[PDB]
Nucleic acid binder design. Structure first.
Ligand SMILES: N[C@@H](CC(=O)O)C(=O)O
Ligand SMILES: [Mg+2]
Ligand SMILES: [Mg+2]
Ligand SMILES: [Mg+2]
Ligand SMILES: [Mg+2]
Ligand SMILES: [Mg+2]
Ligand SMILES: [Mg+2]
Ligand SMILES: [Mg+2]
Ligand SMILES: [Mg+2]
Ligand SMILES: [Mg+2]
Ligand SMILES: [Mg+2]
Ligand SMILES: [Mg+2]
Ligand SMILES: [Mg+2]
Ligand SMILES: [Mg+2]
Ligand SMILES: [Mg+2]
Ligand SMILES: [Mg+2]
Ligand SMILES: [Mg+2]
Ligand SMILES: [Mg+2]
Ligand SMILES: [Mg+2]
Ligand SMILES: [Mg+2]
Ligand SMILES: [Mg+2]
Ligand SMILES: [Mg+2]
Ligand SMILES: [Mg+2]
Ligand SMILES: [Mg+2]
Ligand SMILES: [Mg+2]
Ligand SMILES: [Mg+2]
Ligand SMILES: [Mg+2]
Ligand SMILES: [Mg+2]
Ligand SMILES: [Mg+2]
Ligand SMILES: [Mg+2]
Ligand SMILES: [Mg+2]
Ligand SMILES: [Mg+2]
Ligand SMILES: [Mg+2]
Ligand SMILES: [Mg+2]
Ligand SMILES: [Mg+2]
Ligand SMILES: [Mg+2]
Ligand SMILES: [Mg+2]
Ligand SMILES: [Mg+2]
Ligand SMILES: [Mg+2]
Ligand SMILES: [Mg+2]
Ligand SMILES: [Mg+2]
Ligand SMILES: [Mg+2]
Ligand SMILES: [Mg+2]
Ligand SMILES: [Mg+2]
Ligand SMILES: [Mg+2]
Ligand SMILES: [Mg+2]
Ligand SMILES: [Mg+2]
Ligand SMILES: [Mg+2]
Ligand SMILES: [Mg+2]
Ligand SMILES: [Mg+2]
Ligand SMILES: [Mg+2]
Ligand SMILES: [Mg+2]
Ligand SMILES: [Zn+2]
Lengths: 218, 103, 52, 58, 159
RNA sequence: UUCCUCGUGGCCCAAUGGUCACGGCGUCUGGCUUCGAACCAGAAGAUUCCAGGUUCAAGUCCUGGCGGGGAAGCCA
RNA sequence: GGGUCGUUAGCUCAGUUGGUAGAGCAGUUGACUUUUUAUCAAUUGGUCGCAGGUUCGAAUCCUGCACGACCCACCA
RNA sequence: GGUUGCGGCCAUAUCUACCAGAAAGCACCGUUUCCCGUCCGAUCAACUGUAGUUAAGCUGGUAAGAGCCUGACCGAGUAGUGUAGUGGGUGACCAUACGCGAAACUCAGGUGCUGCAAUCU
RNA sequence: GAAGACAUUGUCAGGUGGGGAGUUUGGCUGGGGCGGCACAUCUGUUAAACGAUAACGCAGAUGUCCUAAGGGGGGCUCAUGGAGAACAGAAAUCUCCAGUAGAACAAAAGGGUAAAAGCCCCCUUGAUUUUGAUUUUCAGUGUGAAUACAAACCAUGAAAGUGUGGCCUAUCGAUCCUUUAGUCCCUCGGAAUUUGAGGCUAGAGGUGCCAGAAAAGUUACCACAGGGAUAACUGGCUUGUGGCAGUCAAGCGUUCAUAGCGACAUUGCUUUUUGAUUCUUCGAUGUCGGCUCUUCCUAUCAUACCGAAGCAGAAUUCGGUAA
RNA sequence: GUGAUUUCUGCCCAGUGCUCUGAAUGUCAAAGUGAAGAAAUUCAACCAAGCGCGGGUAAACGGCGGGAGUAACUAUGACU
RNA sequence: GUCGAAUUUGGGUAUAGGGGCGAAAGACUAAUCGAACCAUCUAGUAGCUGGUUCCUGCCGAAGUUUCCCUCAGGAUAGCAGAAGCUCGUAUCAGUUUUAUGAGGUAAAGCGAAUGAUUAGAGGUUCCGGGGUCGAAAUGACCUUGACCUAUUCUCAAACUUUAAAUAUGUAAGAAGUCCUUGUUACUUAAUUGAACGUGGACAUUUGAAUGAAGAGCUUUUAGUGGGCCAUUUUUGGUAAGCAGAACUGGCGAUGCGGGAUGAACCGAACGUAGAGUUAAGGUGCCGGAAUACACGCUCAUCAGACACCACAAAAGGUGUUAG
């Protein structure tokens, strides 16, 4: 009953999101966007790998869901439920339209053809570009060989060609492994439950004194 | 709508030539008289055989009529007339609007 | 073409009327109003009403 | 049986067959629409001016 | 059905500015316009009276009439295969002097100066402007500026 | 698919934008009778199928969703 | 053959659109009476056919995997 | 240089928290017969400049301050785009030739200027 | 004999009268019909940063309302949040602080507005007269709407000023006829007076198919001029739908993914189903099925030769070369 | 109009027609009457038939419904 | 089938066209019937189909705007010809530069306004639901939902600070500049201003570039008002040799060489000939032109061979080559 995904493979029309003008859409088949031990500290999982795109297409919501499930299943069963953090980096925001067409024998007595053929919503999708990340995983260095092929096992659920990259960065931060390491060696790195804040040379000095006390405590 | 029963406005009566007090009333058509050239011609045409000769309007579409005021000057006793936009309800003697009171 | 046949009862008399017309003829639709009066003491065959 | 509704095709060629030449210019353009209070002055201004030149060169 | 009003498709064209709402600064009313001034049109969305039609936004014309609160302008409009002149009446809020002329007549009086001065000794004043000439010859030294050798950079992912 | 209609006290329904809203059956208390009915005095109970906008007020005015029912489907 | 769905205690059935099973019939015990049927009270009996997502977790949400119901099916 | 009246450009001028202010000016400040207005002389009205105080207004300064403004071969000649090919690719798309050229980001600097008239240790 | 100034007959007038006569039964339209109005208009977008720009494109709206919801002047500042006061609590009235508009401005939406265009108060009728000029739609016609003046008479404010309806973009109508106001002006043609009638200027009575006919159906008993500008057979593109084959692997299979199956996903092929469009044929290509007859395709039921199994034998299943 | 014989032809006149009432503040043409005016003319009253109002008419044209609860297994519902 | 009767039939007579006749079929009425035949109005009307007769020369289009019961048709504007007229290098230009305006698309942004949206962290409850210690407390501890503060991932045709490229308005002088003083019933406190002038001064470097095949002006009328294709932008649709829009170039209206073959592609547009050189395309043979030269790759039991163009994908291979 689902129209094959090849009918919406390419970006042919402008984004058509839910809004005060759309007002009537189904619900995305994906609901979970973070998997694993999502409360892990920044320094717990240094290694980070990305599933990057080599295409300009639309990824269906349930396609994302199926890849999510398969990847999470493999990671948990093999590497353990608390060895990785999974983060999907796209959201289905484009609504797909369909002109449901009468398919009975003799429906031409009723179909009216192409007249007034504005479609109806039946599905959501996410629009991606070349070089845009789809999946992101952060683990320990000892788990990379498992993760990289876990993603390789997951790539089969998306249409098109997608690469797998080992990011030279620490975790989900925007900093390199050594430069970040030395920055945490000094005191201006102060973590939160999942992410980390950084001291800046700007701002009120008293407030900068209040936190990061060790950086000044030389 | 609501319109006061008096109005002060220009009166070109050759003796006023200035704003003067005017009494106002709603204009009405007035009974159509016979012996007008139109009626006389139409009756002549209808006489004899042939049946209905002039078109008869059916496709009425408008619900309201424009209202026309009849102004009477208290001094020169001349009549001037002016029109207003369309309105479903119209009225001269008006209880003025009051704001502070409730429903 | 679709032609309308309708039956309708008179509001005031109560008698029953009906007709049929092609679905385009625009017969006059009357204007009504329900006006919520109160009834005062009943005198002779007149009534006696009350606004707000 | 539909038909082509509207298009501007070939219209630029049709126009450019006869150049979009500017309309014209003249000395002493028309005083249509200018301040009549100014016109009434100007007409007497010239009225006196010509009489002045006439008497001067007389 | 279709819709072509007097102000259709003017949603963004008549938005005032960012952080420039409110009243208009008095300098506009302090401006003085003579007959024959060439002037641009830019509608002010805060003054609904005497607005120009959206087509004339960003156009330039010639003043032909002055009244107590407005100015008469002449605009050339292309219709069909010719131009027709249109006569407008615009309040000064949609009006500002075209500095193109203000720059221009400085040239006129400058050339007057050069012409008279050079006429005092007859040295072929040479008033006409000239485009950018191809630059003439020159010599470049390397003293303390020994040339630097460059090379293409290899490929790195940089993500 | 379209179009239309309907949803309210336990049941069937009625409803004036201006009072938490009406009838009939039903239920409860007291009375009559050995008892139950019938009969005689009195009462109570409703988020008007789910969300917004209007109004001063919305069952009502209307727009967005749920369930039910009806009509259409012809010239080949 | 394709769509549409519903199957919950011995039987019927509310189930709540995402947290733990409701109600009635049934049967057992007790009170009533010379014992009983009727009447009332209290228990008894439901992992809601197999796998996944899993919110703390899933009969309950849906997805595929059972059985029973609804409509569909050249053409001239 | 300070202050007042009238301004021009309209945050480099705004916002938050503190500190300082000779003289003059400004200000707060005293009173209710008259003109005048309010529930109320609080605003507004009138009189005195006398009884007092820089507390506030205001001005200026301070802040690894928010904001705002300017600039830089920081990002970036990237994104985007006009013209051409019997260019590549199954295709989505992508390089080349002649041209134009950002935004976000980073860093550095600044925190009102000025016209007319009058007055001031 | 009967009947009698009644019948009858003649002329007008009202009623009845598909028995009969004449005529009509809009337009757009992914054929036509049903449906809808894209038929006069307005806001945003499609619309590709001047202007213009289509579709039965998307989200909506108009045939009204207003003596104030118009004009002038003066005073005040809103939504909301925080903190306090008897009944009073989440919502009753009052006070302070913060508050760039997050409120309000008749309506649909978009612009615009803070000593205001918002709220309250005072006075008024410029929503007036005379025709002109200009912008939009545009043929540079009309209609509607709007802009800037001039000549008067006014309103408001102390004044500068503002005011020719609603802050701006929609809210509406030709010829003929009737009717009203002004001039009390012109004519009734042999000469006069009074009724009456006809003219000039300015409005109203309406055409919504909105640049404006007065209008119900059926034909399979049908006719004519035409149309492949246009439907049902066939043919052509596409493959939603139908059919067929792959890739990944959660599970089924006593254990074991791939002996045999295979969800959630995803890549393909065909035109033997049914759809979409209308390119060829309407001065005609005979339009279902059954009977008989020839050839071709392989996506193979059996026969030939082989591989695999959860193939002990038998039976069976999957696959290969093979029409 | 129905179509041998046999056996029967139930209910409905609200609707469309047909027919019969006319004691009547219903409505009405021409003619005739009254008033105003100098006259054209204007305004009234009166008025036949017809229609309106009220009965009959189906072997005249024709029509002849829904929704709930209820019985000692269940089901259904004589009953309400 | 019927054959003694509602039987068959000759002759005479009656009924005639909106009429007759009909045991009822719209049947029959002289091969003519859902209205007979003959002549006349009549050469009836046709927005519809077919045709439209000698040669050569020159110029040479449109399927687009507006209105119409308008959609197979007209009027109107535009494109074209003809007749010319006033003058003699200009009041020019599908062009560039300099100077100066306007725009809200492409891009970008959301720890910036609005809306959507994944995730944790810290506080705050006189104030959510709760539970535990508690009789309670404006008491304490946990948990879930809000609320606030600082962070994080992703978005917008009808969101936005910022903001391109390409297109687009105006100016680059004699109708100009400067000095003096004349007119006016307008304006100013005022010969102050405004507008128009007298007189005087400044010319071929007179105010950027390039071209100008002459410039300007008037009348009249035919045909047209079904379009289509290609690149780029782009709407509905899964898509179409589908339907609908923008700019330019073509076809129609167009031949010639190449793409074997073709209206749109490439090159290039045409009087009749001679000679020379090329465009796009090619040089084994058909077929004019090197089985030229040079560096590498590939063996295919369905190899491959040139844009538009006559298709191919996801996924695999110790085949082979270079990284
Ligand atoms: N030839 C008709 C059938 C079309 O299609
Ligand atoms: Mg006569
Ligand atoms: Mg007659
Ligand atoms: Mg056309
Ligand atoms: Mg159209
Ligand atoms: Mg702007
Ligand atoms: Mg009782
Ligand atoms: Mg007839
Ligand atoms: Mg039609
Ligand atoms: Mg535009
Ligand atoms: Mg004010
Ligand atoms: Mg006009
Ligand atoms: Mg005025
Ligand atoms: Mg107002
Ligand atoms: Mg206005
Ligand atoms: Mg009119
Ligand atoms: Mg007349
Ligand atoms: Mg029209
Ligand atoms: Mg007929
Ligand atoms: Mg037929
Ligand atoms: Mg065709
Ligand atoms: Mg078909
Ligand atoms: Mg398919
Ligand atoms: Mg399929
Ligand atoms: Mg066809
Ligand atoms: Mg045919
Ligand atoms: Mg033929
Ligand atoms: Mg044949
Ligand atoms: Mg085979
Ligand atoms: Mg019979
Ligand atoms: Mg009479
Ligand atoms: Mg009578
Ligand atoms: Mg005989
Ligand atoms: Mg028949
Ligand atoms: Mg015959
Ligand atoms: Mg002829
Ligand atoms: Mg017409
Ligand atoms: Mg034709
Ligand atoms: Mg835009
Ligand atoms: Mg964008
Ligand atoms: Mg940005
Ligand atoms: Mg936002
Ligand atoms: Mg420019
Ligand atoms: Mg001709
Ligand atoms: Mg023509
Ligand atoms: Mg023509
Ligand atoms: Mg034609
Ligand atoms: Mg042709
Ligand atoms: Mg050609
Ligand atoms: Mg050869
Ligand atoms: Mg491959
Ligand atoms: Mg290889
Ligand atoms: Zn008067």
């Amino acid at each position: 009953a689902r129209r094959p995904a090849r009918c919406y493979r390419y970006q042919k029309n402008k984004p058509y999101p839910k809004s005060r003008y759309n007002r009537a859409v189904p619900d995305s088949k994906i609901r979970i966007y973070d998997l694993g031990k999502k409360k892990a500290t920044v320094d717990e999982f240094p290694l980070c790998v990305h599933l990057v795109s080599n295409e300009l297409e639309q990824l269906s919501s349930e396609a994302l869901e199926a890849a999510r499930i398969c990847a999470n299943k493999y990671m948990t069963t093999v590497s353990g439920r608390d060895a990785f953090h999974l983060r999907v980096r796209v959201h289905p925001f484009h609504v797909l339209r369909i002109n449901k067409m009468l398919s009975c024998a003799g429906a031409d007595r009723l179909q009216q053809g192409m007249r007034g053929a504005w479609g109806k919503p039946h599905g959501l999708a996410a629009r991606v570009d070349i070089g845009q990340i789809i999946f992101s995983v952060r683990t320990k260095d000892s788990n990379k060989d498992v993760v990289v092929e876990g993603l390789r096992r997951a790539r089969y659920k998306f249409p098109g060609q997608q690469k797998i990259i080992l990011s030279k960065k620490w975790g989900f931060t925007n900093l390199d492994r050594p430069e970040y390491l030395k920055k945490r060696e000094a005191g201006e790195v102060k973590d939160d439950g999942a992410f980390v804040k950084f001291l800046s040379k700007k701002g009120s000095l008293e407030n900068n004194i209040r936190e990061f006390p060790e950086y000044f405590a030389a | 709508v609501n319109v006061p029963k008096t109005r002060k406005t220009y009166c070109k009566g050759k003796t006023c030539r200035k704003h003067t007090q005017h009494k106002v009333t709603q204009y009405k058509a007035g009974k159509a008289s016979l012996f007008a050239q139109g009626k006389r011609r139409y009756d002549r045409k209808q006489s004899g055989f042939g049946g209905q000769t002039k078109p008869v309007f059916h496709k009425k579409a408008k619900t309201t009529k424009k209202v026309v005021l009849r102004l009477e000057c208290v001094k020169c006793k001349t009549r001037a007339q002016l029109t207003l936009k369309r309105c479903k309800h119209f009225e001269l003697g008006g209880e003025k609007k009051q704001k502070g009171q409730a429903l | 073409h679709a032609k309308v046949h309708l039956v309708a009862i008179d509001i005031f008399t109560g008698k029953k009327l009906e007709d049929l017309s092609p679905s385009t003829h625009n017969m006059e639709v009357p204007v009504v109003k329900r006006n919520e009066y109160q009834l005062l003491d009943i005198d002779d065959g007149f009534l006696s009403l009350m606004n707000m | 049986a539909k038909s082509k509704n509207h298009t501007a095709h070939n219209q630029t060629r049709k126009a450019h067959r006869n150049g979009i030449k500017k309309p014209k210019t003249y000395k002493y353009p028309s005083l249509k629409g200018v301040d009549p209070k100014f016109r009434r002055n100007h007409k007497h201004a010239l009225h006196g001016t010509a009489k002045a030149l006439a008497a001067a060169k007389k | 059905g279709k819709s072509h009003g007097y102000r259709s498709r003017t949603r963004y064209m008549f938005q005032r500015d960012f952080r420039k709402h409110g009243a208009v600064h008095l300098s506009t009313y302090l401006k003085v316009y003579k007959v024959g001034d060439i002037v641009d049109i830019k509608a002010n969305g805060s003054i609904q009276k005497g607005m120009p039609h959206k087509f004339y936004q960003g156009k330039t014309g010639v003043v032909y009439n002055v009244t107590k609160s407005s100015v008469g302008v002449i605009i050339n409009k292309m219709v069909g295969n010719r131009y027709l002149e249109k006569r407008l009446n615009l309040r000064v809020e949609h009006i500002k002097h075209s500095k193109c002329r203000q720059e221009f007549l400085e040239r006129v009086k400058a050339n007057a100066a050069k012409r008279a001065e050079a006429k005092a000794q007859g040295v072929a004043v040479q008033l006409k402007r000239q485009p950018a000439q191809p630059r003439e010859s020159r010599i470049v030294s390397t003293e303390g500026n020994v040339p630097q050798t460059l090379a293409p950079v290899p490929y790195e992912t940089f993500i």
